[PDB]
């Protein structure tokens, strides 16, 4: 709803020709529009459904002691890697579906 009521209130004002939408006063609206159009083009070519997923949608909800905590898994019963991701997905070419 927050996306659709923003899109409709942008479409009414932008077609009005009496109310100016200038990006000198705010240049980050256009990046939101273009990133939304990027991410909608991405999950349309893969037929993924957003906005109503049954996933959790939340990320990780929760020194000299990491070797001590490693052997703590030994004497109680008695280093994570890096991540890599981008802001935007690959364009739409270089996808296995798109040839």
């Amino acid at each position: 709803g927050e996306i659709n009521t923003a899109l409709n209130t942008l479409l009414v004002t932008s077609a009005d020709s009496n109310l100016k939408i200038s990006l000198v006063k705010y240049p980050e609206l256009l990046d939101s529009l273009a990133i939304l159009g990027m991410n909608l083009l991405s999950n349309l070519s893969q037929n993924v459904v957003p906005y109503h997923r049954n996933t959790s949608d939340y990320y990780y909800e929760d020194q000299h002691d990491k070797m001590v905590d490693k052997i703590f898994e030994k004497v109680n019963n008695n280093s994570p890697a890096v991540k890599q991701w981008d802001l935007l997905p690959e364009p739409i070419r270089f996808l296995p579906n798109q040839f």
Binding site: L19, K20, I21, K25, E28, Q63, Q84, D86
Partner: protein, 250 residues
Amino acid sequence: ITNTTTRVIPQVEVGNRKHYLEDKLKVYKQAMNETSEQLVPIRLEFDQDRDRFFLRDTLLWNKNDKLIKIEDFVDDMLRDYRFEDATREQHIDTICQSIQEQIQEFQGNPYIELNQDRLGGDDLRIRIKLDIVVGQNQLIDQFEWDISNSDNCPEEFAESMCQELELPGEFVTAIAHSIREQVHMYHKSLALLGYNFDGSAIEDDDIRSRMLPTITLDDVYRPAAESKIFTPNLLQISAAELERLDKDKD
């Protein structure tokens, strides 16, 4: 207020500040090439003479950070100190140039971090003294700190001390800044004298007299009259001092 005559109001602002608009590409260009941090202790002192402001705030700063423009952070800080909008003849450029100078002199953690890292470090224990004033309380305490160890965390010790003493939190971010200050001003004096940080062979007179001697079996307990210096004293009250030798150091 929405119930109006249908204007377009771009970014109605809070605290007389336009919202910070990120780049979102330099953020990922920096956050993925993110080897180390190299925090910088930064000191700001100004008086009513030769300056108009006072601005005695001390902060840490990431040296490898290329995201935030430093003049924008200083301009945000002066707005946080409630300076009125005539804040350029009492320049933001003076504070920005001071902070620009203080991060250029920071030679970094030397070859104790750069080339080699002996597990456990060396015997280089230095005599850290601190003197902090917050409100009307004055924390005076001294201890020993191994400058030759890389896994010595000043912040994890500052939180530990303010845990025991039940300090408010300005002492949390002042003790760690004092550690980061004095360890850096010893590392700089070591690096400018060509110390060659792996083989020790200290070979000087002003330093090697500030360094502490080797703890033996007998010296594992300090003497009683020597113990009364190495204890934190919560002397509450205001402070009063000055500093002007520009000519004397010249």
